[PDB]
Design an enzyme around this catalytic site. Structure first.
Site, mmCIF file in Angstrom:
data_model
loop_
_atom_site.group_PDB
_atom_site.id
_atom_site.type_symbol
_atom_site.label_atom_id
_atom_site.label_comp_id
_atom_site.label_asym_id
_atom_site.label_seq_id
_atom_site.Cartn_x
_atom_site.Cartn_y
_atom_site.Cartn_z
ATOM 1 C CG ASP A 143 143.141 34.087 23.002
ATOM 2 O OD1 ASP A 143 144.144 34.362 22.517
ATOM 3 O OD2 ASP A 143 142.028 34.545 22.584
ATOM 4 C CD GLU A 186 136.120 42.072 15.157
ATOM 5 O OE1 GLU A 186 136.402 42.734 13.726
ATOM 6 O OE2 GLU A 186 136.896 41.365 15.878
HETATM 7 O O1 LIG Z 1 142.189 36.766 13.254
HETATM 8 C C1 LIG Z 1 141.166 36.380 13.438
HETATM 9 O O2 LIG Z 1 140.114 36.169 12.995
HETATM 10 C C2 LIG Z 1 140.999 36.950 15.214
HETATM 11 O O3 LIG Z 1 141.729 37.988 15.455
HETATM 12 C C3 LIG Z 1 141.755 38.611 16.868
HETATM 13 O O4 LIG Z 1 142.068 37.339 17.748
HETATM 14 P P1 LIG Z 1 143.467 36.841 17.864
HETATM 15 O O5 LIG Z 1 143.519 36.683 19.580
HETATM 16 O O6 LIG Z 1 144.604 37.259 17.063
HETATM 17 O O7 LIG Z 1 143.108 35.309 17.584
HETATM 18 P P2 LIG Z 1 142.858 33.643 18.339
HETATM 19 O O8 LIG Z 1 142.833 34.028 19.567
HETATM 20 O O9 LIG Z 1 144.077 33.010 17.643
HETATM 21 O O10 LIG Z 1 141.311 33.431 17.479
HETATM 22 C C4 LIG Z 1 140.060 33.869 17.817
HETATM 23 C C5 LIG Z 1 139.215 32.568 18.189
HETATM 24 O O11 LIG Z 1 139.078 31.854 16.851
HETATM 25 C C6 LIG Z 1 139.554 30.457 17.508
HETATM 26 N N1 LIG Z 1 140.517 29.562 16.357
HETATM 27 C C7 LIG Z 1 141.775 29.803 16.214
HETATM 28 C C8 LIG Z 1 142.414 29.469 15.183
HETATM 29 C C9 LIG Z 1 142.208 28.357 14.619
HETATM 30 O O12 LIG Z 1 142.483 27.790 13.705
HETATM 31 N N2 LIG Z 1 140.707 27.865 14.914
HETATM 32 C C10 LIG Z 1 139.652 28.705 15.738
HETATM 33 O O13 LIG Z 1 138.702 28.129 15.984
HETATM 34 C C11 LIG Z 1 140.532 30.512 18.702
HETATM 35 O O14 LIG Z 1 140.395 29.588 19.594
HETATM 36 C C12 LIG Z 1 139.782 31.961 19.309
HETATM 37 O O15 LIG Z 1 138.644 31.365 20.274
HETATM 38 C C13 LIG Z 1 140.043 38.908 17.175
HETATM 39 O O16 LIG Z 1 140.053 39.198 18.569
HETATM 40 C C14 LIG Z 1 139.288 37.539 16.958
HETATM 41 O O17 LIG Z 1 137.725 38.004 17.159
HETATM 42 C C15 LIG Z 1 139.543 37.215 15.562
HETATM 43 O O18 LIG Z 1 138.752 36.113 15.038
HETATM 44 MN MN LIG Z 2 142.647 35.596 20.867
#
Ligand SMILES: O=C(O)[C@H]1O[C@H](OP(=O)(O)OP(=O)(O)OC[C@H]2O[C@@H](n3ccc(=O)[nH]c3=O)[C@H](O)[C@@H]2O)[C@H](O)[C@@H](O)[C@@H]1O
Ligand SMILES: [Mn+2]
Ligand SMILES: O=C(O)[C@H]1O[C@H](OP(=O)(O)OP(=O)(O)OC[C@H]2O[C@@H](n3ccc(=O)[nH]c3=O)[C@H](O)[C@@H]2O)[C@H](O)[C@@H](O)[C@@H]1O
Ligand SMILES: [Mn+2]
Lengths: 245, 250
Positions: A109, A191
């Site tokens: 995203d 990270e």
């Molecule tokens: O909480 C976290 O671990 C994440 O917090 C932030 O990112 P954020 O934008 O809050 O989170 P998401 O965009 O919802 O998730 C990060 C990535 O993990 C993936 N994801 C999320 C949720 C899930 O259930 N499964 C999954 O594969 C998303 O598609 C996305 O590529 C950080 O930028 C991410 O690197 C980190 O993994």
């Molecule tokens: Mn994100």
């Protein structure tokens, strides 16, 4: 220098949209290999189809996460790079041992500028750059002095106070450190749980013109309201489930 | 057939990120002219710079927005004025296509998601073409119901009184038709949701809509919206005199 982009994804209303704009951005980068890992029980036709029609060099991986997200997915992409297999589509064979390259963990995203990728190709060990709209700031990034990281512009607490989108790792360095991976139990510390295994924060290679330019943004997408859908569902007039969104 | 993409945009934290991915998506489409209209007092260095570095064919326009809170109306009508020979370009291609030119006009807001496939669908538009839009109007997708290659109704729920219950991103208009219908423009006084109908009603009847995207069975565009960035920490860091370097554009 081939850039391996590790992207964990999961099904939700905006998934395809996110993957459409991300893959469209990636199709603008040469020598790029997309490692898309679904957080699912099996490959989904949506992702498999999106990938097959993207025209990108990719490898499709799948792994379910029963707290930090995308961890098990990113770690599986790493296992693949280390020759432990796991591909369900695309290029099944990983880069041979001793292959040059750089690995970048790009969430589905965020917004990535095409310039960003050219910056990381020169990564020797681990490079860093500012990330916009993250950590509650206009941008979060390394403090640079004479071309060296002397600190970090951040507001939250972490030896590596950088967002997932703010760094890249040389492939040889990851192969050399077989144990280096993300800690699924790590809280802001995700990270670091990886990077600590690879380098010292003072050895980070600043990019983006000594971290003076923001080339990636931590954008998030709103969850679509579905009140009307539920209403039409009750009437048996829901959006045709055979039409993918 | 050149596609003229009309995009109203305004400065806010996520603006550059939005214009970056949109401009990157548009660079994938051939024969596309971007009409980027800033809602501002004059051209901004941020947008002017992004356009210059985009490598796209574009025309930079500018107009300030002067209860329903219609968005991008003045900006969209400004792009129409320019197409109609009333000038107003502050950068890029200064002159509009002369009358008689074949092309299509598409109103693309700066936060939606567009598949490159959508543009080939609209490139062949005689009057007004239509297709379904994903995640809009409170539905998985909102779009025309098609039978025998013709629109015979709409799958919609929000504001059903709309003669054209389709999002801004769900249609395109033939350039000659717009020039032939000088009064056709967006109505800033129209109810929340009737903005699209305020233009289209001067152009066609819903029955004459040209269904694209495999007779409206494919969703090739999504009404995505970006979350407003949390800036609590930035506010605090400022007070301490250590706010994010203002000299670094975001
Ligand atoms: O909480 C976290 O671990 C994440 O917090 C932030 O990112 P954020 O934008 O809050 O989170 P998401 O965009 O919802 O998730 C990060 C990535 O993990 C993936 N994801 C999320 C949720 C899930 O259930 N499964 C999954 O594969 C998303 O598609 C996305 O590529 C950080 O930028 C991410 O690197 C980190 O993994
Ligand atoms: Mn994100
Ligand atoms: O209420 C409305 O008028 C809008 O409602 C929905 O869209 P939505 O996503 O809610 O709205 P925005 O994305 O915030 O605005 C649409 C466009 O107008 C622009 N805008 C918005 C606000 C503003 O002050 N100035 C301005 O130029 C935005 O950059 C964007 O390109 C429709 O999809 C839009 O076509 C419609 O203009
Ligand atoms: Mn929008």
């Amino acid at each position: 220098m081939t850039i391996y982009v590790v992207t964990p994804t999961y099904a939700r209303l905006v998934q395809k949209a996110e993957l459409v704009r991300l893959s469209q951005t990636l199709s603008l980068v040469p020598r790029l290999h997309w490692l898309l890992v679904e957080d699912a029980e099996g490959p989904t036709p949506l992702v498999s189809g999106l990938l097959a029609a993207s025209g990108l060099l990719f490898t499709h991986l799948v792994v379910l996460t029963p707290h930090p997200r995308g961890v098990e997915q990113r770690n599986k992409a790493l296992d693949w790079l280390r020759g432990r297999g796991g591909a369900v589509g695309g290029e099944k064979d990983p880069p041979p041992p001793g292959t040059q390259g750089v690995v970048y963990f790009a969430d589905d995203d965020n917004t990535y500028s095409r310039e960003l990728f050219e910056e990381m190709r020169w990564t020797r060990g681990v490079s860093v750059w500012p990330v916009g709209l993250v950590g509650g700031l206009r941008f979060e990034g390394p403090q640079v002095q004479d071309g060296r990281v002397v600190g970090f512009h951040t507001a939250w607490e972490r030896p590596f106070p950088v967002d997932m989108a703010g760094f890249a790792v040389a492939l040889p360095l990851l192969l050399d450190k077989p144990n280096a991976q993300f800690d699924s139990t790590a809280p802001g510390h995700l990270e670091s749980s990886l990077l600590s295994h690879l380098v010292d924060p003072k050895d980070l290679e600043p990019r983006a013109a000594n971290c003076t330019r923001v080339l990636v943004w931590h954008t998030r997408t709103e969850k679509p309201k579905m009140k009307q859908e539920e209403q039409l569902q009750r009437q048996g007039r829901g959006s045709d489930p055979a039409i993918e969104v």
